[PDB]
Amino acid sequence: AKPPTRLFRGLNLSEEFTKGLIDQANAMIANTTERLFTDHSPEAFKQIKLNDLSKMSGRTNASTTTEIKLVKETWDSNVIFEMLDPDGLLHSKQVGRHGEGTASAFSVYLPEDVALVPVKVTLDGKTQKGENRYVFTFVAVKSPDF
Numbered sequence: 001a002k003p004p005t006r007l008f009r010g011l012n013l014s015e016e017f018t019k020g021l022i023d024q025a026n027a028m029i030a031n032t033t034e035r036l037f038t039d040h041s042p043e044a045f046k047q048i049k050l051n052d053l054s055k056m057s058g059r060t061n062a063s064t065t066t067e068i069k070l071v072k073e074t075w076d077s078n079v080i081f082e083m084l085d086p087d088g089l090l091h092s093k094q095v096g097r098h099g100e101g102t103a104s105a106f107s108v109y110l111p112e113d114v115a116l117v118p119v120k121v122t123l124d125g126k127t128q129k130g131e132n133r134y135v136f137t138f139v140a141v142k143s144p145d146f
Ligand SMILES: NC(=O)c1cccnc1
Pocket: 008, 009, 010, 011, 063, 064, 065, 071, 075, 105
């Protein structure tokens, strides 16, 4: 199928929530993701699923795009989730354009045994409201199997 291996999704999130989201991601990046990446930790996997930073957990048809500019220039999201899926662990179905005012997209399902593991939070410019725009980069990883 050769699904796309990088997808983006944006949300408009409040200032206060976004600040807490940054802090939570960076706490996991330094402190939880390491256990998953180095020691293939089941507990660390579970904590990442439960935290669900991206709000993707359980969604079977969340809309995404391969083009980050489409997110920025359609919804002017202040928070953009960049999902790296080299193993095609997501179920990514192309939803083509169908008529006026539409755009191509990928509809995604995040299985319970796939975690979007946070790896970075990066400042990426400003929204049209003058908000700082943040990109949260994740890698999709399979539950460890011992
Ligand atoms: N159609 C959408 O809701 C959407 C949102 C963010 C990124 N890509 C698509």
